[PDB]
Design an enzyme around this catalytic site. Structure first.
Site, PDB file in Angstrom:
ATOM      1  CG  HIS A 186      76.427 -18.608 -24.233  1.00 39.46           C
ATOM      2  ND1 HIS A 186      75.521 -17.565 -24.214  1.00 39.46           N
ATOM      3  CD2 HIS A 186      76.629 -18.950 -22.937  1.00 39.46           C
ATOM      4  CE1 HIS A 186      75.157 -17.320 -22.969  1.00 39.46           C
ATOM      5  NE2 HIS A 186      75.820 -18.140 -22.173  1.00 39.46           N
TER       6      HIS A 186
HETATM    7  C1  FAD Z   1      82.433 -17.369 -18.184  1.00 40.58           C
HETATM    8  C2  FAD Z   1      81.310 -18.280 -18.659  1.00 40.58           C
HETATM    9  C3  FAD Z   1      79.967 -17.879 -18.494  1.00 40.58           C
HETATM   10  C4  FAD Z   1      78.882 -18.737 -18.924  1.00 40.58           C
HETATM   11  N1  FAD Z   1      77.672 -18.637 -18.227  1.00 40.58           N
HETATM   12  C5  FAD Z   1      76.638 -19.505 -18.582  1.00 40.58           C
HETATM   13  C6  FAD Z   1      75.262 -19.218 -18.222  1.00 40.58           C
HETATM   14  O1  FAD Z   1      75.005 -18.077 -17.476  1.00 40.58           O
HETATM   15  N2  FAD Z   1      74.261 -20.051 -18.612  1.00 40.58           N
HETATM   16  C7  FAD Z   1      74.508 -21.149 -19.334  1.00 40.58           C
HETATM   17  O2  FAD Z   1      73.397 -22.008 -19.732  1.00 40.58           O
HETATM   18  N3  FAD Z   1      75.759 -21.446 -19.697  1.00 40.58           N
HETATM   19  C8  FAD Z   1      76.867 -20.653 -19.343  1.00 40.58           C
HETATM   20  N4  FAD Z   1      78.124 -20.857 -19.895  1.00 40.58           N
HETATM   21  C9  FAD Z   1      78.248 -21.710 -21.053  1.00 40.58           C
HETATM   22  C10 FAD Z   1      78.287 -23.227 -20.693  1.00 40.58           C
HETATM   23  O3  FAD Z   1      79.044 -23.428 -19.544  1.00 40.58           O
HETATM   24  C11 FAD Z   1      78.904 -24.048 -21.804  1.00 40.58           C
HETATM   25  O4  FAD Z   1      78.333 -23.803 -23.034  1.00 40.58           O
HETATM   26  C12 FAD Z   1      78.621 -25.508 -21.547  1.00 40.58           C
HETATM   27  O5  FAD Z   1      79.129 -25.803 -20.312  1.00 40.58           O
HETATM   28  C13 FAD Z   1      79.399 -26.281 -22.603  1.00 40.58           C
HETATM   29  O6  FAD Z   1      79.563 -27.588 -22.054  1.00 40.58           O
HETATM   30  P1  FAD Z   1      80.559 -28.539 -22.856  1.00 40.58           P
HETATM   31  O7  FAD Z   1      80.475 -29.991 -22.460  1.00 40.58           O
HETATM   32  O8  FAD Z   1      80.282 -28.435 -24.331  1.00 40.58           O
HETATM   33  O9  FAD Z   1      82.043 -28.084 -22.573  1.00 40.58           O
HETATM   34  P2  FAD Z   1      82.561 -27.761 -21.133  1.00 40.58           P
HETATM   35  O10 FAD Z   1      81.458 -27.528 -20.204  1.00 40.58           O
HETATM   36  O11 FAD Z   1      83.202 -26.438 -21.147  1.00 40.58           O
HETATM   37  O12 FAD Z   1      83.554 -28.904 -20.645  1.00 40.58           O
HETATM   38  C14 FAD Z   1      84.581 -29.321 -21.538  1.00 40.58           C
HETATM   39  C15 FAD Z   1      85.563 -30.058 -20.698  1.00 40.58           C
HETATM   40  O13 FAD Z   1      86.531 -30.764 -21.487  1.00 40.58           O
HETATM   41  C16 FAD Z   1      87.797 -30.537 -20.875  1.00 40.58           C
HETATM   42  N5  FAD Z   1      88.853 -30.636 -21.789  1.00 40.58           N
HETATM   43  C17 FAD Z   1      89.138 -29.787 -22.802  1.00 40.58           C
HETATM   44  N6  FAD Z   1      90.247 -30.209 -23.458  1.00 40.58           N
HETATM   45  C18 FAD Z   1      90.697 -31.394 -22.835  1.00 40.58           C
HETATM   46  C19 FAD Z   1      91.816 -32.322 -23.064  1.00 40.58           C
HETATM   47  N7  FAD Z   1      92.731 -32.073 -24.119  1.00 40.58           N
HETATM   48  N8  FAD Z   1      91.963 -33.392 -22.264  1.00 40.58           N
HETATM   49  C20 FAD Z   1      91.086 -33.612 -21.269  1.00 40.58           C
HETATM   50  N9  FAD Z   1      90.028 -32.799 -20.993  1.00 40.58           N
HETATM   51  C21 FAD Z   1      89.821 -31.669 -21.774  1.00 40.58           C
HETATM   52  C22 FAD Z   1      87.678 -29.145 -20.447  1.00 40.58           C
HETATM   53  O14 FAD Z   1      88.697 -28.841 -19.478  1.00 40.58           O
HETATM   54  C23 FAD Z   1      86.352 -29.128 -19.858  1.00 40.58           C
HETATM   55  O15 FAD Z   1      86.446 -29.757 -18.613  1.00 40.58           O
HETATM   56  C24 FAD Z   1      79.163 -19.949 -19.540  1.00 40.58           C
HETATM   57  C25 FAD Z   1      80.534 -20.357 -19.694  1.00 40.58           C
HETATM   58  C26 FAD Z   1      81.591 -19.514 -19.252  1.00 40.58           C
HETATM   59  C27 FAD Z   1      83.075 -19.988 -19.458  1.00 40.58           C
END
Ligand code: FAD
Ligand code: FAD
EC number: 1.-.-.-
Lengths: 649, 649
Positions: B575
């Site tokens: 997280h």
């Molecule tokens: C194993 C695991 C278990 C978890 N379980 C839960 C849960 O039970 N409950 C809950 O509420 N949350 C859960 N989460 C946490 C939650 O998924 C994340 O906190 C949330 O999705 C964060 O969203 P975000 O937009 O900040 O980043 P992300 O959702 O992770 O997306 C970021 C995106 O940017 C892309 N990206 C990164 N670098 C580049 C680049 N250089 N060029 C192009 N694209 C890029 C990545 O590939 C990804 O697609 C879990 C996550 C994981 C990995």
């Protein structure tokens, strides 16, 4: 655009050497592309003690092998043989590749491995002169400081070796065929001649000695400097600050901070290479004659796979578009070494224990190592090569150090503190390590620290319902690494027991106790070996044994508890290799099968891991590549008194 | 070349939503660049049980969070607070980013945290309609299966709750200010009304319940599908197979398998974005209006850094050529949650135990979770916010699951087998996790799985020579995580003692025993808390206490031995957040400080971790970016009955 005849990817143990000599002996434009830059003035690198953290910043206190500015961070997949652990193994990133950040123990590997485990054209008489070249270019030194404990251990091994020779059993761990009936153990008499584990004709396959050879040189002011592939071949005498070769070497152009993506093809001919500079701008280098890949065991195969050479079925499935040659072997057959750790407590008066453990502190001429040997198979190892009784195979590199070499989590659990002045370390490094793994890119776009790297070690054998006799030969292979590792513990145990005697004979009022793994368990193991003999290892699978005696259960139980220590009381080596080996990814001329003009010339081409640390062997392949590419033995025929001139900057 | 008005980097929880609603409510050209591709036809992702390994190959038996084809592999630097361990933490890589591979427990995070720890303009009444939008788009479900043990446990928490209420002490862990004197515990009668931890007005800050809400939807054939950011906003009703938005959404263009390198600037105005396609070719995207970086806590800051936004001295020094704005805070202030694990054994007749632990098996509607709560501070935690007596803070997320949730090495050491049918798991997850870390690119050239990630957790306090009175407040901060973590264990001990009573009352002939960590240590811990009160935690540093009684030493020893378990008897949550937070790297409009037109709209922008899982919060921020970029509350005013229509392909 940059245009070169020969383009080399990766300035490591092999690439730097390859690059240096190709420029000297030819009129070609040689372009060397390297992901990192030079660290010729970086005390973290150039002072051999920097390896041990002497110059680490206090708030970011990490070793080079843990530091992404200094290395690639190869996070492998969960080790099913070690509680799901994910060791992160490095390749150095800079001039010299991994030799930039390594511990500098320079080992050829013994004659035997090349004669038996390597193909025709790569036998020991084919490579010994290239090895000689690699060594003289480095000019390694011996330990500058004699320690009493080293002599005590040698005299102890001499006795055991004598028992082994005399008993007449055909294979055992201190026997060495080429030195006949006399123990091949260095003398501790006043005027003893040092033994060289690297002797030219390879007589000393199995041998115990007082000193390894470290890749350092002493400078005229008395400091020692790391003497490695980086500053040896690419220093300012040979390459200027703009990456341009000097004089005879003017054909070389070295591109710093150049992260290579892929090899570009027309049919099955390589025509170009992609890389990205530090500004995030992509560049194309046209290739006139050949590409040579020298990016390390982890990464050379990921470049070919990403370039379209490998398992078509897998590559298509992850979105690789341009496919060049179907060879499912690319990236397979990954091998390494492995170092289980033991700890000894020395009993006696503090002042006397102190005397016994004096002169062990690490310095540049020894990198912490105070001995001791290259050893053969334990007599009770069921997995010896077929001809092991007629030529002497290396199985362990036995290393002795001061201090407490187990991991931090294990120090806590064991009660063994690194600040205890009565402890020291022994390692029986398995240098014929049975596990085999493989590498697969997860994505097609760019180089990644983390491809899929599968490498499972100490797996369990799960019994079937089949008759015992049909399962045992199966179980034997699966259990191979646990088997060899436990026999390593016994080697150290045997050795400690004779040292209890020879220490007394040398006037030391001490006794020695093996305390990691647990003293009680090792005692029980030794007795079991004597008791159950050759089939002792059957007790790893008690349920197939059908020995429900109190005695039987205890020995099965003992092996069970012991299987833990090589799993977590140990270190996986950074000696990865063979992932694109001769006969599998490439032919005997190092050319990639299915291409007109691409070669692999680093350790990933090695047919089978060498008997000892892998730097020497890696530079050796690169050395030969010079001569393979140029069509003449220029480097083989080069007089040994002509060596590269060292510049510290 | 491609040209867009708004360019979004990362189709994650935030990025997917943002792209979707921006296309709908504007006439701008929206380009969404995502490193992976869609997995709308990959049963490993689309089937909620695929998370647990349902479609895993036996030989490559690794989870999505371990698989480089499905995710980025963030190997952090050695944790000085956990025996030098180096956890590898994931970001999902594909449409939906991390919601593609996560465990789907959907949690808003509570009113209290937004009202206090987030700045003005971002208080709970400001964001609650955005949270509602996120939930209705997903439409999460409750557990479809009642287990007696969940209710036995709830009734046990009620009892503890009555005692806390009665004692009148201002802060303790089941107290909830907004629900007064009445236990905020779900009732256990035949027709009990369910408690909703995500209740619109945020009343249930501290609350005990039978069911979390899972991001799954039920299909007409009775199967459940993962309902996540990828397929909710970017399915085939909205974006075609060529990445072209459909109809009203036709201004959107989605680039698959697009690894973004950096942002290109003219002064401090963003004008372009670099990426590399799956064929290894670099492309430039022109930006007319704004860039929004939504690449996750680990990687969003590395993009900015590569772009010239960060510590000029560090960036210059590693060869970032083009510098934009000096802000050494970029990549700092990294937070996460953390889950120490406990294991309990159920005693009694095999048949009665079986009945008591029945109906716990994981399915899509529960993902293994059988309860239980969001809890407040333990009364003996010295680190409460100043106003904890006037508003109720969430401190732990309490989870109950079947099986044995400790790491494989700890199962072996502890003797607790996962295939043993009398064991289950309890977790008090610290969601006010004290540690803070930071991220630094190691190289300038390319995105890497592994930048430098520093995150040290359960560190020790080393006494100085200054008077005790001056040191204790320093030690208090350092030890905050150990303090909070052991207290989590005590909450759990308490709950279990009271469950021994309620189990009996519900007619189960069983007794319950906490067996991980060792029963003896937890017993000793509980007694010390009662004995030593508010200053119990002084005994983490015995040398400052000067209590040389037999009793003092036992409690100190007890705290020492217990400190081992949160370190390795645990999992770091995935997280991670707050690494580019409001007030530090960006302003309250999500605009990157120092730039004309770059925004961060993902979890890296979060001011303070929400009280629970972060998906909901991550999406909430992306949602606000929609209205922020557009200048009107389009998305805020949208009726809750208007939702994206699901297409499964
Ligand atoms: C194993 C695991 C278990 C978890 N379980 C839960 C849960 O039970 N409950 C809950 O509420 N949350 C859960 N989460 C946490 C939650 O998924 C994340 O906190 C949330 O999705 C964060 O969203 P975000 O937009 O900040 O980043 P992300 O959702 O992770 O997306 C970021 C995106 O940017 C892309 N990206 C990164 N670098 C580049 C680049 N250089 N060029 C192009 N694209 C890029 C990545 O590939 C990804 O697609 C879990 C996550 C994981 C990995
Ligand atoms: C921690 C550690 C300890 C070791 N201990 C010793 C020891 O005591 N004794 C010993 O004999 N050996 C030791 N080694 C092992 C030995 O150094 C290696 O086996 C040997 O260097 C392998 O050489 P190589 O050329 O084949 O690969 P490398 O030496 O690792 O060269 C790889 C090079 O390729 C470059 N590269 C990779 N990908 C790209 C790309 N996409 N574009 C451009 N360049 C790229 C890298 O920057 C690197 O320079 C150790 C290594 C490590 C990391």
């Amino acid at each position: 655009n940059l245009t070169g005849d020969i383009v080399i990817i990766g300035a490591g143990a092999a690439g730097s050497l390859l690059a240096h000599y190709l420029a000297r002996f030819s009129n070609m434009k040689i372009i060397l592309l390297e992901a990192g830059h030079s660290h010729f003035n970086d005390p973290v690198v150039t002072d051999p003690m920097g390896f041990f953290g002497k110059y680490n910043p206090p708030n970011e206190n990490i070793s080079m092998s843990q530091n992404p500015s200094y290395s690639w961070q190869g996070a492998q997949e969960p080790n099913t043989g070690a509680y799901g652990n994910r060791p992160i193994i490095a390749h150095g990133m800079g001039f010299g590749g991994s030799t930039m950040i390594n511990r500098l123990n320079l080992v050829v590997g013994g004659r035997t491995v090349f004669d038996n485990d390597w193909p025709v054209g790569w036998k020991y008489d084919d490579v010994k002169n290239y090895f000689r070249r690699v060594l003289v270019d480095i000019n390694p030194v011996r330990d500058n400081t004699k320690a009493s404990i080293t002599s005590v251990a040698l005299d102890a091994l001499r006795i055991i070796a004598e028992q082994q020779i005399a008993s007449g059993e055909p294979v055992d761990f201190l026997l060495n065929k080429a030195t006949g009936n006399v123990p091949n153990v260095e003398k501790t008499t006043p005027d003893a001649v040092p033994l060289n584990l690297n002797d030219y004709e390879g007589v000393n396959s199995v041998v115990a000695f007082s000193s390894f050879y470290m890749g350092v040189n002493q400078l005229s002011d008395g400091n020692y400097i790391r003497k490695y592939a980086g500053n040896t071949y690419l220093n300012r005498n040979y390459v200027d600050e703009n990456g341009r070769g000097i004089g005879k070497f003017s054909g070389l152009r070295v591109v710093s901070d150049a992260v290579v993506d892929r090899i570009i093809f027309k049919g099955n001919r390589a025509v170009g290479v992609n890389y990205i500079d530090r500004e995030g701008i992509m560049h194309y280098v046209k290739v006139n004659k050949e590409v040579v890949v020298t990016s390390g065991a982890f990464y050379t195969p990921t470049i070919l796979q990403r370039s379209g050479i490998g398992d078509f079925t897998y590559l298509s499935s992850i979105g690789v578009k341009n496919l060049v040659y179907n060879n499912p072997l690319v990236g397979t057959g990954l091998k390494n070494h492995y170092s289980p750790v033991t700890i000894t407590r020395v009993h006696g008066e503090p002042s006397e224990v102190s005397r016994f453990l004096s002169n062990m502190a690490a310095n540049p001429t020894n990198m912490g190592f105070k001995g001791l040997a290259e050893l053969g198979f334990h007599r009770l190892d069921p997995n010896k090569p077929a001809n092991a009784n007629t030529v002497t195979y290396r199985k362990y590199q036995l290393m002795m150090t001061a201090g407490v070499g187990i991991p931090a989590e294990q120090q806590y659990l064991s009660g063994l503190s690194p600040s205890s002045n009565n402890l020291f370390t022994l390692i029986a490094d398995d240098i014929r390590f049975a596990p085999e793994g493989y590498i697969k890119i997860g994505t097609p776009n760019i180089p990644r620290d983390v491809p899929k790297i599968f490498f499972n070690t100490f797996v369990t054998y799960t019994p079937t319902s089949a008759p015992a006799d049909q399962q045992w030969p199966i179980a034997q292979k699966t259990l191979a690494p646990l088997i060899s590792a436990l026999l390593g513990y016994d080697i150290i145990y045997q050795t400690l027991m004779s040292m209890n005697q020879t220490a007394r004979d040398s006037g030391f009022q001490v006794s020695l106790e093996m305390v990691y793994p647990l003293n009680d368990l090792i005692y029980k193991l030794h007795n079991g070996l004597a008791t159950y003999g050759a089939n002792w290892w059957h007790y790893f699978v008690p349920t197939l044994v059908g020995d429900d005696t109190p005695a039987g259960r205890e020995f099965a139980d003992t092996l069970s508890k012991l299987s833990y220590y090589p799993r977590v009381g140990a270190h996986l080596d950074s000696h990865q290799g063979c992932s694109c080996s001769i006969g599998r990814t490439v032919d005997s001329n190092l050319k990639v099968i299915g291409t007109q003009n691409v070669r692999v010339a680093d350790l990933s081409a090695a047919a089978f891991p060498p008997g000892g640390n892998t730097w020497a062997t890696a530079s050796m392949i690169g050395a030969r590549a010079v001569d393979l590419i140029l069509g003449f033995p220029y480097l083989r025929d080069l007089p040994v008194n002509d060596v590269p001139i060292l510049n510290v900057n």
